[PDB]
Amino acid sequence: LLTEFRSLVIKNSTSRNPSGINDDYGQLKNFKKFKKVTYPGAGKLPHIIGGSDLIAHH
Amino acid sequence: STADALDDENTFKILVATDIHLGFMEKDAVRGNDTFVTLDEILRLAQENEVDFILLGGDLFHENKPSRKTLHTCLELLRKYCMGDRPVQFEILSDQSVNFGFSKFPWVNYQDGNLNISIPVFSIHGNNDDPTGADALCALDILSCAGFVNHFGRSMSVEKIDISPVLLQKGSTKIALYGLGSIPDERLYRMFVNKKVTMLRPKEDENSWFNLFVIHQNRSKHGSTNFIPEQFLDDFIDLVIWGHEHECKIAPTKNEQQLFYISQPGSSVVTSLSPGEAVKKHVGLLRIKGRKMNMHKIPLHTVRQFFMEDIVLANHPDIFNPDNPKVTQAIQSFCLEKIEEMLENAERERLGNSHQPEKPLVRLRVDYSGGFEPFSVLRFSQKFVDRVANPKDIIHFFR
Amino acid sequence: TADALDDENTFKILVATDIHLGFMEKDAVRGNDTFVTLDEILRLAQENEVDFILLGGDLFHENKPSRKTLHTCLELLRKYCMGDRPVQFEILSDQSVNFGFSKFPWVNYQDGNLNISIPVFSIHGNNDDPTGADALCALDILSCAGFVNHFGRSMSVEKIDISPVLLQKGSTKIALYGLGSIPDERLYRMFVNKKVTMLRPKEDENSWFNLFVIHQNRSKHGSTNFIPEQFLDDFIDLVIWGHEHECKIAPTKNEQQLFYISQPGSSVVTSLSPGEAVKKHVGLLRIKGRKMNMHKIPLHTVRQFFMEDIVLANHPDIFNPDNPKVTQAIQSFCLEKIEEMLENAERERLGNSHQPEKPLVRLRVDYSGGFEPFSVLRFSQKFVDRVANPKDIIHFFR
Ligand SMILES: [Mn+2]
Ligand SMILES: [Mn+2]
Ligand SMILES: [Mn+2]
Ligand SMILES: [Mn+2]
């Protein structure tokens, strides 16, 4: 059973603080770090200019 | 159910698959999409079961240099499914940089601040896709740099190998994942002989690490050192994902001598017409809780069906008489009947599966020992051109 | 003036083309130059808070890029495109029409899964045009990755409808017309047959800055082996000609068609030609209302190229065809010229550490008049460790 043993838990002088997300149930366990950023028009009906809105140039 | 209770905050749900050989026979007219559709099905199953993460056994791309279409299809599928919003409820305790040193972004994909990873993909490069070139790069490197697949288990040094683990913790459960990329069998055998293989273990909570190992090496012995004996590995390893062997034995099996289990998920596509390939393909959902484990095999509904049968003419002297001038005609008749029965079974099975491919694969192995003469395979196969996926490989004569 | 132009209603576009990424990769001396230049341009983009890059095509030199080339391209794009910088402009066109061939038909950043900070728009240049029954190109791979939005594809070859992508930021708006590279003769025939059309928005028709990128030969290399500028219509405001590698990034007014044409030129010296000699640049094109402003920025990592032609017949005093030693005098003069070239190269290099150490050289010699060429290899031996292309330092022609 015994083999090479090396302290692998990554704890520096200050132990690593796991990341989290708003607690949806109890204390939700999330460690992701993605947050899609907003762009203009977000949450707004798109003002799309297509189909008949475009005209061939004569 | 018992499985539902076993699905808790402290239970890992690892989906296991191997040897997708994506893009295999891509240029084929009939089998062209088999690999792609199979990958779609496996990823969809991963999503539906809400798996904590995927652990692919290697050989992800059939060719060492995947063709453009293959890479595009794989990448779009991964982006479509594995990118999402469902929370990931496990955390990494190891030194990520050590595990993924060869990547300029040394951290697990879902920890990237810019990618919305939902279903992280872990894998280990297989024989067909091992790093190559002076740069020593592989397709999994392309995907990883793109930010989809976490490529782990790389070997920094050829003289000596230090298989460091990635420590995955979910609640009270912890896992030590030990992956060893595909290495040529003779060399790895010799290195094991020379005591050049070492496995690091965490000094902390030593007994509390379900030691999970993955390898891509031949399991059967085809030569003096043209394989890897199980006896080499140590008993502290809890579960082993033997991947390279395409035949499926997904059911975990205990090694009495070594006291650890060995799982052979097998290929996700029938790359060859061999008896091992005939077994129904499956993909394993592994559950880990504490020091215990459980494996549940899931059928694939898109894997093109393979039916094989070995017929020995000499074992039917009543039916086959070599002296009989018309023995060849009777042989053809019986082979035709057997192939009809195989197709009947294939259609019967397919009836319940819509997505299943329509034309299954069939190979009849004929032992013509005893003076029996093989006949024109081409002319016989002419009659099943529209029925089977291997019209040119319906029968096989051997002695 | 530039600061005043830099407003919430002002676009900030970085334009470059013919990156020819990875070309001559395997070489020891210039192998890494392409990646260094790509890093330089991306870093310039990220430093000047550019709204979006508009690569003119040929983003990969080889139709099927090498594993290393693709890996490094993805690496750099990840390091310098993904971030927390918000994108401050908006799409107004119907997206699926433009990126329909992708299973995710929308501008990459509009996808929720990816944190794009600096969008990349491009077209497909000749060397990386779609090929195979699948009609996919490396830029399609990057698109699927969600890094580069490959726009301007043409579904049919018999008819072409260049649907613009409409981009607005504050008050200012842009119509971006991207026509991918096409075989020149075929495109010429299509223009002659009136099969070419460029759709326009009915709304505020005159308020849309019509910007049209194209990758085609400019100079007349044949009867129909190029694209006369007269084919374009005057409603187009600015044209970014991409294929030609001579850098002419200074906008030029064509008195006839009343449209500006800017030629960013390649970012790396692919071939030894006089046009390649000019110093390369990258344009921080700005747009506001119907007025535009292009400001060039030199690249500190493009391998230096010095070129000069020498007509021996033009120096009768120095060289006499009847002189038996004429070969040696010619060789001495060539050595002196090359030494002066190297001196100037080092002089200019001294001001930028990043610049490549071994400058490139190509000396064209017009040996007409009964003169004979001398050994190229023997003469070039003296600089094998001094110039980046020692095997071809001199060119003899008549
Ligand atoms: Mn395999
Ligand atoms: Mn294998
Ligand atoms: Mn070019
Ligand atoms: Mn070109």
UniProtKB/Swiss-Prot annotation, chain A:
Cystine residue pairs: none
Tissue: Ubiquitous. Expressed at high levels in testis.
Cross-linked residues, Glycyl lysine isopeptide (Lys-Gly) (interchain with G-Cter in ubiquitin): K32, K36
Effect of K29R: Does not affect ubiquitination by PELI1
Subcellular location: Nucleus; Chromosome; Nucleus, PML body; Chromosome, Telomere
Effect of K11R: Does not affect ubiquitination by PELI1
Coiled-coil regions, chain positions: none
Induction cue: Up-regulated by ionizing radiation (IR).
UniProt PTM comment: Phosphorylated by ATM in response of ionizing radiation, and such phosphorylation is responsible intra-S phase checkpoint control and telomere maintenance. Ubiquitinated at Lys-32 and Lys-35 via 'Lys-63'-linked ubiquitin chains by PELI1: ubiquitination takes place following PELI1 phosphorylation and promotes ATM activation and DNA repair.
Modified residues (Phosphoserine): S19
Domain free text: The FHA and BRCT domains specifically recognize and bind phosphorylated proteins.
Involvement in disease: Nijmegen breakage syndrome: A disorder characterized by chromosomal instability, radiation sensitivity, microcephaly, growth retardation, immunodeficiency and predisposition to cancer, particularly to lymphoid malignancies.
Protein family according to the UniProt entry: Belongs to the Nibrin family.
Protein's job: Component of the MRN complex, which plays a central role in double-strand break (DSB) repair, DNA recombination, maintenance of telomere integrity and meiosis. The MRN complex is involved in the repair of DNA double-strand breaks (DSBs) via homologous recombination (HR), an error-free mechanism which primarily occurs during S and G2 phases. The complex (1) mediates the end resection of damaged DNA, which generates proper single-stranded DNA, a key initial steps in HR, and is (2) required for the recruitment of other repair factors and efficient activation of ATM and ATR upon DNA damage.
Assembly description: Component of the MRN complex composed of two heterodimers RAD50 and MRE11 associated with a single NBN. The MRN complexes dimerize on DNA to form joined MRN-MRN oligomers required for DNA double-strand break repair. As part of the MRN complex, interacts with MCM9; the interaction recruits the complex to DNA repair sites. Component of the BASC complex, at least composed of BRCA1, MSH2, MSH6, MLH1, ATM, BLM, RAD50, MRE11 and NBN. Interacts with histone H2AX; this requires phosphorylation of H2AX on 'Ser-139' and promotes NBN recruitment to DNA damage sites.
Name this polypeptide is given: Nibrin
Organism: Homo sapiens
Portion of the full-length sequence here: 655 to 712 of 754
Curated annotation (Swiss-Prot), chain B:
Active site (UniProt): N128 (proton donor)
Keyword hit for Membrane: no
Gene designation: MRE11
Annotated source species: Homo sapiens
Phenotypic consequence of K254R: In 4KR mutant; strongly decreased SUMOylation
Modified residues (N-acetylserine): S1
Cofactor: Mn(2+)
Enzyme class: hydrolase
Crosslinked residue numbers (Glycyl lysine isopeptide (Lys-Gly) (interchain with G-Cter in SUMO)): K383
Annotated phenotype, changing N116L: Abolished interaction with NBN
Activity regulation summary: Interaction with SAMHD1 stimulates the double-strand-specific 3'-5' exonuclease activity. RBBP8/CtIP specifically promotes the endonuclease activity to clear protein-DNA adducts and generate clean double-strand break ends. DYNLL1-binding inhibits the activity of MRE11. MRE11 activity is inhibited by C1QBP: in absence of DNA damage, C1QBP interacts with unphosphorylated MRE11, preventing formation and activity of the MRN complex. The mirin-derivative PFM39, specifically inhibits the 3'-5' exonuclease activity.
E.C. number(s) listed in UniProt: 3.1.-.-
Effect of K383R: In 4KR mutant; strongly decreased SUMOylation
Cross-link Glycyl lysine isopeptide (Lys-Gly) (interchain with G-Cter in ubiquitin) residue location(s): K338
Phosphoserine: residues carrying this PTM: S1, S274
Protein's job: Core component of the MRN complex, which plays a central role in double-strand break (DSB) repair, DNA recombination, maintenance of telomere integrity and meiosis. The MRN complex is involved in the repair of DNA double-strand breaks (DSBs) via homologous recombination (HR), an error-free mechanism which primarily occurs during S and G2 phases. The complex (1) mediates the end resection of damaged DNA, which generates proper single-stranded DNA, a key initial steps in HR, and is (2) required for the recruitment of other repair factors and efficient activation of ATM and ATR upon DNA damage. MRE11 contains two DNA-binding domains (DBDs), enabling it to bind both single-stranded DNA (ssDNA) and double-stranded DNA (dsDNA).
Consequence when changing F236C: In a breast cancer sample; somatic mutation
Binding site for Mn(2+) 1: D19, H21, D59, H246
Name by which UniProt lists this protein: Double-strand break repair protein MRE11
Cross-link (Glycyl lysine isopeptide (Lys-Gly) (interchain with G-Cter in SUMO2)): K254
Effect of P87W: Does not affect interaction with NBN
Site of covalent link Glycyl lysine isopeptide (Lys-Gly) (interchain with G-Cter in UFM1): K281
